[PDB]
């Protein structure tokens, strides 16, 4: 199935749009956090899709973010970013696709951190 | 219309595959050249191909390396095609020109891919 | 000679730091602008700065985002500087223009970095 | 210290240049292979430098190559490629440096594989 994750840290953020975004792309359940992430990650099983609106939601730590993406990779859970649909197949050569996946994810992690 | 460009260094390279690839992705005409991808000054067929295409046409190759093995040249060629508003397609990269929602990311992707491949092709 | 360009959206941004950065990396003159990095048409100071620099000069900013928050524009500006043969430097990227042996890789690096940062700056 | 690794698979390759290359940049010892790699990796300790002439030497498998680079990272051994000196600091912002390290390494791994 399709699992969703949403985070906002402070007491003034447009959480609705986010949750509605996760809903938009097919999130049947959504883990919202203001360990919830842990729950989210331990919940997902092989064959599921794990979705966020953006990597910054997932974290703002290069190392950790990468570690988490690798965790999902290990568990064979499809990671998707609602702001990066089609991110999987940019070209049609799965190898290049994988490489680009990595790049994008890393550019984004770095951005998320540096902010 | 759809123009294709095909290049091989020798004849033991499977040129048929390449031509059939260009035909499949819609080549109405194919400019075929037996030559090194090291420069364009020694590639008048490429020149003909490029001068032939006009705004609204599609230009198709099997790989960037087919187009050349020189970063600056390849880049300049890609930009040349962009300026003339000719669609560059790479049949091994079928989903590259697919508008997938966010133009910024898309263009960024293109530039990136093309440059990586340009360098790859050159360094070899 | 070394020309610097400095931009801030408001005055609560630490403009002194930026100016001192440009001064340190050798700004003889600094074109200072209070404006959004969303476009150049509303940035005549940038225009003056760009027209001022000539072949042999250095153009220095603290960050690409200072230069703008528009991919195409930034890229076009970088290429503009390249065409006029003016050295673009980013003081936060001091070792970027350092010739480190392999020109191909170097140029590839530049293009890449600059484009990543262009997009970053835009998307924000 | 500085450890070197060199590989050639077949019976007709310019091994001299390679070994001399590893020698050039300061290789005190060189592991040459036609498990030797295992030896090379288990040999290096914290603080050492591990050097190859090129990533393809190190392998032609995206996954494995990456895994190995991560292994060296874990062990805090500096990886260097004699054809990519200065690769560490392209800009002067260590974060971006790390990111670029990753990129380059991956472009190269992909190239090494696809050939």
Curated annotation (Swiss-Prot), chains A, D:
GO biological process, alphabetically ordered: DNA integration; transposition
Membrane-spanning residues: none
Active-site residues (renumbered): 9
Coiled-coil portions: none
An MF annotation (GO) of this entry: DNA strand exchange activity
Sequence ranges assigned to domain Resolvase/invertase-type recombinase catalytic in this UniProt record: 1-115
Alphabetically ordered keywords of this record: DNA integration, DNA invertase, DNA recombination, DNA-binding, Plasmid, Transposable element, Transposition
Assigned protein family: Belongs to the site-specific recombinase resolvase family.
Task performed by this protein: Potential DNA invertase.
Name of protein: Putative transposon Tn552 DNA-invertase bin3
Organism (species): Staphylococcus aureus
Boundaries of the shown chain within the full protein: 1 to 124 of 202
């Amino acid at each position: 199935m399709i699992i969703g994750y949403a985070r906002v840290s402070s007491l003034d953020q447009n959480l609705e749009r986010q949750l509605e975004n996760l809903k938009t792309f097919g999130a049947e359940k959504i883990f919202t956090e203001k360990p919830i992430l842990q729950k989210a990650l331990n919940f997902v099983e092989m064959g599921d899709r794990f979705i966020v609106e953006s990597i910054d939601r997932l974290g703002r730590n290069y190392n950790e973010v990468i570690h988490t993406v690798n965790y999902l990779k290990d568990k064979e859970v499809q990671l998707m970013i609602t702001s990066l649909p089609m991110m999987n197949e940019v070209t049609g050569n799965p190898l290049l696709d994988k490489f680009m996946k990595d790049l994008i994810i890393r550019i984004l992690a770095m951005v998320s951190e540096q902010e």
